[PDB]
Amino acid sequence: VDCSEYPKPACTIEYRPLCGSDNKTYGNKCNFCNAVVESNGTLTLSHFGKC
Amino acid sequence: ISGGDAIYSSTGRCSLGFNVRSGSTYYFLTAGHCTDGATTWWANSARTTVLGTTSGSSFPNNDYGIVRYTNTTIPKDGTVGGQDITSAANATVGMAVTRRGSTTGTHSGSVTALNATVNYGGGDVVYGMIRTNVCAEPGDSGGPLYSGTRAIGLTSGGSGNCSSGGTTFFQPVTEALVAYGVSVY
């Protein structure tokens, strides 16, 4: 997952989970990538699917 | 099964918008971004219960899709959860609305703007959207937005969340009902 096109002011909300390095399950990649931005790039992908 | 209930494609999970029909043919509406690239739809994550197949999909630009029921025994309730739905209507600024999704459940709020343009990026732009202060989260896509017994919109996308609050955009359902020649019941 690449978060270069982020941040994005909106995200569609279908469920396709990703597990972040903060042990939080993000509902989809747009959500995950916006958070990465908000973390100023400290948040990373740990694995695909739920944490 | 009814509006707000979870629906699974081969890609992920969305929510059923409203059960609709044309003559004696039953369909169900949901978000276009959910029907885009999906063929079959199931009622569970196990994929053991089939709902139907995608018959139409419009996204971006708009955000609706329709799925034809192939399952002949599953109940197809003309409600949202237990909330009967008897007609559809146009959103209005200040209108009090309620959304139901498979992730967050039911949440209420109000219409804060109409004919909004939402840019989801990469050329995915949708127009004529209803803006609201209702929250919604991943999995809620395609769920109904209603006002009493009136169908209003289909959940498309937005920002924030139900904990800290947020903004959600909806596709007017009147436009989807008209494109497909279907109607709520």
UniProtKB/Swiss-Prot annotation, chain A:
State where the protein is found. Secreted
Domain of life of the native organism = Eukaryota
Q: Where is this site: Reactive bond 3 for chymotrypsin, elastase, proteases A and B, and subtilisin?
A: 13-14
Every Kazal-like domain range: 1-51
Any S-S bridges, and between which cysteines? 3-33, 11-30, 19-51
Q: List the carbohydrate attachment sites.
A: 40
Q: What is known of its domains?
A: Avian ovomucoid consists of three homologous, tandem Kazal family inhibitory domains.
Q: What protein name is recorded for this chain?
A: Ovomucoid
Q: What is the lineage of its organism?
A: Eukaryota, Metazoa, Chordata, Craniata, Vertebrata
Portion of the full-length sequence here: 135 to 185 of 185
From Swiss-Prot, chain B:
UniProt keywords, alphabetically: Disulfide bond, Hydrolase, Protease, Serine protease, Signal, Zymogen
Disulfide-bonded cysteine pairs: these are 14-34, 135-162
The record's active-site residues are: 33, 63, 141
**One GO term of the biological process aspect:** proteolysis
Q: Which GO terms describe its molecular function?
A: serine-type endopeptidase activity
Q: Which GO terms describe its cellular component?
A: extracellular region
Assigned EC number: 3.4.21.81
The record's catalysed reaction(s) read: Hydrolysis of proteins with trypsin-like specificity
Task: Name the family.
Answer: Belongs to the peptidase S1 family.
**What is the stated purpose of this protein?**
Has a primary specificity for large aliphatic or aromatic amino acids.
Name by which UniProt lists this protein: Streptogrisin-B
What organism does the record attribute this protein to?
Streptomyces griseus
| Name of encoding gene | sprB
Residues of the whole record sequence present: 115 to 299 of 299
